[PDB]
């Protein structure tokens, strides 16, 4: 019955570490490439749009 005890203690006291993070740039190398999207492509894209709609108005006129 010694065995039960020995393995008991070692096992029950033991905690093995959660398979560990290596990468967390995902969030980041995105959210920065999401700015890459926004500011960089937002601005250029919105500024273009304005010229279109600006000529149409007068073209509706």
């Amino acid at each position: 019955a010694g065995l039960v005890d020995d393995f008991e203690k070692k096992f029950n006291a033991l905690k093995v570490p959660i398979p560990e993070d290596k990468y967390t740039a995902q969030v980041d190398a995105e959210e920065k490439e999401d700015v890459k999207s926004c500011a960089e492509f937002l601005t250029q894209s919105k500024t273009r749009i304005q010229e279109y709609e600006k000529e149409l108005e007068k073209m509706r006129n």
Partner: protein, 66 residues
């Protein structure tokens, strides 16, 4: 363990004599020891030849999708 007293008295008496001995519980006998060692092998095959006095442990990993 126990029934018919007329045989049983003697028969059970001899069985206890076994327990009341420590050159084996009265003896053992080669024949048993040979089979024991065999059977002990086989059941290790039954559940793999690791020793479950210890438990397993694992390892960890990750990769990038894009």
């Amino acid at each position: 363990l126990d029934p018919v007293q007329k045989l049983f008295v003697d028969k059970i008496r001899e069985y206890r004599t076994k327990r009341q001995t420590s050159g084996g519980p009265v003896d053992a006998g080669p024949e048993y020891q040979q089979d024991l060692d065999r059977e002990l092998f086989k059941l290790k095959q039954m559940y793999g030849k690791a020793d479950m006095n210890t438990f397993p442990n694992f390892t960890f990993e990750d990769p990038k999708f894009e």
